């Protein structure tokens, strides 16, 4: 199917506690494959998936140099943001970036991304055309003017249409045992009496990859959106994910309820009941 590659940067100032920390993580789909942390004893890009370990020494030297340059660049960006927002040097602030590409089953670029946040709010983002920017406020408009003058969008576009998709295609081939394997959810319903009058039915999905999934409850064939407690999909720690959805139902009425599961590893959506 389709696939994605994303890099995530976090830069965190901490006045009085040294210089700002810089972290990068890289993902293919829901699989972490590389990390960098400026607080590490000897900061380097490090592998986190077996299929990236075969990249040669030149790869690791180049990737590490990119991250080491970024540590310095993002410390400068944090100082600039203080100016743009009229902020004091006493507080702690965060810049985040996410960039990368989505490809279709044929490996062609579906879309590219390069977007940034300051203190958890959108700051500036490359538009889907890969040629123009959306700035969130007058501060980000200053950055936008600079990036328009320097034709940054065109340089991003050359990366996103080239090296981004080429490297993702290589990773998908080298990791085809895992990156190209969906693990379907293992599903079941549990039953938990609350009182004489009510019981909780909980529909479980376990052991699935990738993380995207839909779990719903119906009563008499009608979706129970407002009456369903749905936990965030959560990592198991073995690459797979877990999720549950629960409804409170009157005693004796359990058979009016059905749980419905959709996941890319299932050839057909599943219906379950207590």
């Amino acid at each position: 199917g389709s696939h994605s590659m994303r890099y995530f940067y976090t830069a965190m100032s901490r006045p009085g506690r040294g210089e700002p920390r810089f972290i990068t993580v890289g993902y293919v789909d829901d699989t972490l494959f590389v990390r960098f942390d400026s607080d590490a004893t000897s900061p380097r890009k490090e592998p986190r998936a077996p299929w990236i370990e075969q990249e040669g020494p030149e790869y690791w030297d180049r990737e590490t140099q990119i991250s080491k340059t970024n540590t310095q660049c993002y410390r400068e960006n944090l100082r600039t943001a203080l100016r743009y927002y009229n902020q004091s040097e006493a507080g702690s602030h965060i810049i985040q970036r996410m960039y990368g590409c989505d490809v279709g089953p044929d490996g062609r670029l579906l879309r590219g991304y390069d977007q940034y946040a300051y203190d958890g709010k959108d700051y500036i983002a490359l538009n889907e055309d890969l040629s123009s920017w959306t700035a969130a406020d007058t501060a980000a408009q200053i950055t936008q003017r600079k990036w328009e003058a320097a034709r940054v969008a065109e340089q991003d576009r050359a990366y996103l249409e080239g090296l981004c998709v080429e490297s993702l295609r290589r990773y998908l081939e080298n990791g085809k045992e895992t990156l190209q394997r969906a693990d379907p959810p293992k599903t079941h319903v549990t039953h938990h009496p609350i009182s004489d009058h009510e019981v909780t039915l909980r529909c479980w999905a376990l052991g699935f990859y990738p993380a995207e999934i839909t779990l719903t409850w119906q009563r008499d064939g009608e979706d129970q959106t407002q009456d369903t407690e749905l936990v965030e999909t959560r990592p198991a720690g073995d690459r797979t994910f877990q999720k549950w959805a629960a409804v409170v139902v009157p005693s004796g009425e359990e058979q009016r309820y059905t749980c419905h599961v959709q996941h890319e590893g299932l050839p057909k959506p599943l219906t379950l009941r207590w």
Binding site: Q65, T69, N77, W147, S167
Partner: peptide
């Protein structure tokens, strides 16, 4: 693989 060009805010 990362993009090796960074652009200042």
């Amino acid at each position: 693989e990362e993009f090796g060009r960074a652009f200042s805010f």
